[PDB]
Design a protein around this ligand. Structure first.
Ligand SMILES: CC(=O)N[C@H]1[C@H](OC[C@H]2CCC(=O)N2)O[C@H](CO)[C@@H](O)[C@@H]1O
Length: 513
């Protein structure tokens, strides 16, 4: 481990944040060490921020220009200058705090110049501000009320719902209420959004919405607009899959089977059409090593930043330098960016550590590693999950110290491939014994078995139905876990194939129900 003085010498990075956090959690950062420390933190968010703030509380921040505006309360806002009045009325809580006569007075003041403020003031003078704002079709006001409180729910007419998608807040609004199965009147109302008025993820989610109300024609039209507008081929393919499942046009499935993206939907389309398995690149460097230390986390942060910022020309130099067995994960990382994400790389590094597991287990391990870290041994996430298998410190210490009693265990042992694969195996055994499906395991590996168990206990998730289990996979309530599962499942199919232990993805989908 490294003292605060030596860390200060390193470039700002997630690795440097991780090591500062370790000092903080062990109470080794004095108040004096803590003085200049927020300029030494690459991502001042979450636990490193709460820990530093127990030592040095946040004196900021209210802008010096409006400082005087924040000396007023609901009882004295009428004594404040007009600029201060308008600044404070940015907060709906502040508006809700005001007494009704002052809302009336302020509504008049602001009607000519800030009718937005007028609408919110007078809305809060009613027993249902949302209904007042909906009647005015004040779109900005609608999203401020939604962000103030999710409990407001009301039917929205065709005119109003068609205006919502032009606001930045629309996409997360639609996603949230559809995935969480909240705001039923809002949700039902969004059946009448013209597909011409939406695109990309919003259109896709409005398709999922339509399916939940069994409006299959509307759904198809939404998914078609999504397929046309989505930027990434992976997402287009997800949308084309729905177009096919709903209307059964064989041109759609054919297009999906010919996708350059390797994902569960293109894999499935290839399987349904007797199309051959996609070509997987074979990387077999003859050179054994270079000078690079695959166990130094600071070196990875540095080289990662280089690789990410390299022009197409410097990629070629990096490619050659890292074309060794020992740096195979970095080589494939470079190649993936060099070939503008067109080729399929599915490496198996430090394979000696897993060659004795059955092949199905090898594939699940490799599938998880590929998504978690791209096999970078010193990978560190923004939540300080560590190594190839991205263990959180808590779980790493529980397995390493309590369960396995490894002598002198430290959480940084997760940076060692032998340890990452071993702990991954151990943890995957726990999850698979309870959950069975590799997809369910993936969800639980990323989101925890608690969330997974709760999701699978619901009446409406992964049961029988027309569009199952595909519909359920779109309604997994955490975005990250929804995405993670699809990607890990694709990876799993591929590695099973490479290991000569093929399984039909159609069997995987049957076993989800
Ligand atoms: C190094 C890192 O941040 N890993 C995270 C991974 O990031 C995907 C991309 C970016 C980094 C990389 O190599 N793969 O996404 C997972 C969720 O899908 C998380 O559980 C992992 O902790």
């Amino acid at each position: 481990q490294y003292s605060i003085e030596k860390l200060k010498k390193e470039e700002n990075s997630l690795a440097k944040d991780y090591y500062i956090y370790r000092l903080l959690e062990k109470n080794k950062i004095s108040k004096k060490d803590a003085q200049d420390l927020n300029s030494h933190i690459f991502r001042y968010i979450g636990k490193i921020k709460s820990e530093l703030e127990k030592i040095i509380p946040l004196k900021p921040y209210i802008n010096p220009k409006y400082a005087k505006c924040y000396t007023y309360t609901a009882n004295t806002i009428l004594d404040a200058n007009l600029t201060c009045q308008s600044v404070r009325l940015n907060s709906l809580v502040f508006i809700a705090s005001l007494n009704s006569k002052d809302r009336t007075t302020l509504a008049q003041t602001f009607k000519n110049q800030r009718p937005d403020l007028t609408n919110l003031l007078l809305a809060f003078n009613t027993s249902d501000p949302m209904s007042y704002i909906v009647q005015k079709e004040d779109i900005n006001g609608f999203f401020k009320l939604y962000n103030y409180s999710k409990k407001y729910d009301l039917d929205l007419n065709t005119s109003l719902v068609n205006k919502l998608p032009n606001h930045i807040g629309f996409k997360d609004f639609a996603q949230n209420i559809i995935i969480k199965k909240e705001n039923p009147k809002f949700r039902h109302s969004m059946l009448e959004i013209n597909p011409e008025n939406v695109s990309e993820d919003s259109a896709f989610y409005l398709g999922v919405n339509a399916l939940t109300y069994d409006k299959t024609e509307l759904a198809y039209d939404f998914f078609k607009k999504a397929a046309q507008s989505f930027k990434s081929q992976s997402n287009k393919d997800n949308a084309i899959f729905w177009m096919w499942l709903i209307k059964n046009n064989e041109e759609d499935l054919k297009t999906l089977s010919q996708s350059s993206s390797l994902n569960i939907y293109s894999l499935y389309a290839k399987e349904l059409t007797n199309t051959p398995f996609p070509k997987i690149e074979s990387l077999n460097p003859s050179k054994k090593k270079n000078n690079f230390n695959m166990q130094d986390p600071f070196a990875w942060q540095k080289i990662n930043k280089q690789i990410r910022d390299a022009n197409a020309s410097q990629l070629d130099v990096l490619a050659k330098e890292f074309d060794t067995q020992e740096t195979l994960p970095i080589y494939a990382y470079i190649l993936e960016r060099k070939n503008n994400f067109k080729k399929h790389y599915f490496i198996m590094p430090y394979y000696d550590n897993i060659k004795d597991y059955n092949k199905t287990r090898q594939a699940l391990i490799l599938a998880i590693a590929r998504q978690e870290s791209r096999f970078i041994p010193t990978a560190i996430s923004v939540s300080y999950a560590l190594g190839m298998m991205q263990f959180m410190p808590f779980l790493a210490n529980h397995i390493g110290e309590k369960e396995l009693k490894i002598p002198n265990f430290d959480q940084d042992f997760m940076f060692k491939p032998e340890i990452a694969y071993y702990f991954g195996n151990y943890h995957l055994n726990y999850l698979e014994s309870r959950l069975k499906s590799p997809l369910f395991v993936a969800y639980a590996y990323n989101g925890g078995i608690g969330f997974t168990n709760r999701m699978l206990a619901r009446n409406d998730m992964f049961k029988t139905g027309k569009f199952e289990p595909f519909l359920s996979m779109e309604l997994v309530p955490y975005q990250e876990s929804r995405i993670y599962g699809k990607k890990v499942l694709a990876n799993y199919i591929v590695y099973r194939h490479l290991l000569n232990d093929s399984i039909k993805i159609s069997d995987i989908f049957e076993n989800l129900i």
